[PDB]
Amino acid sequence: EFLKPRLVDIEQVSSTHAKVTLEPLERGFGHTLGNALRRILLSSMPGCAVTEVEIDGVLHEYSTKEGVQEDILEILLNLKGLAVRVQGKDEVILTLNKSGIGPVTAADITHDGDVEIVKPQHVICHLTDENASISMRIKVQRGRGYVPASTRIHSEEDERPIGRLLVDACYSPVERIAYNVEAARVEQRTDLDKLVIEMETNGTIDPEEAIRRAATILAEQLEAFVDLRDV
Amino acid sequence: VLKIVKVYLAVKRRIQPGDKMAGRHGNKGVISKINPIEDMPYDENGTPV
Amino acid sequence: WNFDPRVEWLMGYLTSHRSQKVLVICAKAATALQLEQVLREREGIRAAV
């Protein structure tokens, strides 16, 4: 004779902003679950992000192209923010090719099946010359957490092509997490609480899958606890 | 001297524990620890410091 | 060395079999130098002539 919380309505206000509700929470477990989920979400949500980039006419991050106004380094900085959803493969090669005057946005990426470009309006560059043309190949991987270039440099593994441009990998889609435990008047009970998780992401991980995976991870660690050897 | 060859290296230094950071008012400090986002304090709205 | 499909096949096989030493024979030394240059500047493959 106990209760247990069931996942209820998940309102989506915007593509990035989401509210998830959990109705039948026992007194006291509101904050426990709120915080556990906040921690797991902020720390461990797997996402995909660009790991390295190859642009044609550029030797290193610090050089500059004709007919663009951003520096190449700023192009990498723009790519770091690219929110992308990869479904099947672990490493995909996206291709960006644009010519002529105009802003090179994220929408211009060559449309592949398995990859979803969440924010096509995201700017990359501005051309400023009729005959100026930019071509690049952006390599996107799946991962968890935060891995900088400089740590992976120990494991270079034939980084030999000087055209290669390494980018720091922020393998995490979630930007912000807040939760509120508030009185959940259930028709036959006095003091019950509902947990409301409000989350802001770059628009790659869907709310339901994020929450499910986080609960999965926490449940797995609890599983680790259930058995105790004492041997 | 016959000839000279100069080579410029460029290095991206990220902030790490032990570096010195300061404000404009004379407050100083050494960055002591990099905390995960979740550990950092956050206001009701959820924005972390 | 940019459109010849043999070069792409060579790179693909090498980059897919990085843990194998491969003996690659070509006709003339000039083509060998061009091959070293292209494997280096487009796949970073270490190759002695």
Swiss-Prot record, chain C:
It comes from the Bacteria. Coiled coil: none annotated. Interacts with the RNAP. Has a higher affinity for the core RNAP than for the holoenzyme. Its ATPase activity is stimulated by binding to RNAP. Transcription regulator that activates transcription by stimulating RNA polymerase (RNAP) recycling in case of stress conditions such as supercoiled DNA or high salt concentrations. Probably acts by releasing the RNAP, when it is trapped or immobilized on tightly supercoiled DNA. Does not activate transcription on linear DNA. Probably not involved in DNA repair. Belongs to the SNF2/RAD54 helicase family. RapA subfamily. This is RNA polymerase-associated protein RapA. It comes from Escherichia coli (strain K12). The chain holds residues 485 to 533 of 968 of the full protein.
